[PDB]
Amino acid sequence: ARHETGGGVNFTLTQPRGNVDLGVGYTAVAATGTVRNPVTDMGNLPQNF
Amino acid sequence: DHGQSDPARPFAATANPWASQRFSYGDLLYNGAYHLNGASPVLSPCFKF
């Protein structure tokens, strides 16, 4: 569409898209190999009840 | 401030009580405002901190 608000027309083009998990087997295992960085450190934070 | 924790050492407030606090001889010798050096020509490395 088009905005009659100022700043342009700026409206959203949208596309729908459907998919099915295809294959009775397992089909695309993924493997986890490397460590970039721990998001939390091994820290010293005590539990505070 | 010394109610809050050190970032680098999150489990302690400050590792060094004299240098870290305001007005405290790690401050008084080497802060840019008090200038016990500043007429002296010798490089002060702690002026970086």
From Swiss-Prot, chain B:
Belongs to the herpesviridae major capsid protein family. It comes from Human herpesvirus 2 (strain HG52) (HHV-2). The chain holds residues 1228 to 1276 of 1374 of the full protein. It is found in: Virion; Host nucleus. Homomultimer. Makes the hexons and eleven out of twelve pentons. Interacts with triplex proteins 1/TRX1 and 2/TRX2; adjacent capsomers are linked together in groups of three by triplexes, heterotrimeric complexes composed of one molecule of TRX1 and two molecules of TRX2. Interacts with scaffold protein; this interaction allows efficient MCP transport to the host nucleus. Interacts with capsid vertex component 2/CVC2. Interacts with the small capsomere-interacting protein/SCP. Transmembrane segments: none annotated. This is Major capsid protein. Self-assembles to form an icosahedral capsid with a T=16 symmetry, about 200 nm in diameter, and consisting of 150 hexons and 12 pentons (total of 162 capsomers). Hexons form the edges and faces of the capsid and are each composed of six MCP molecules. In contrast, one penton is found at each of the 12 vertices. Eleven of the pentons are MCP pentamers, while the last vertex is occupied by the portal complex.
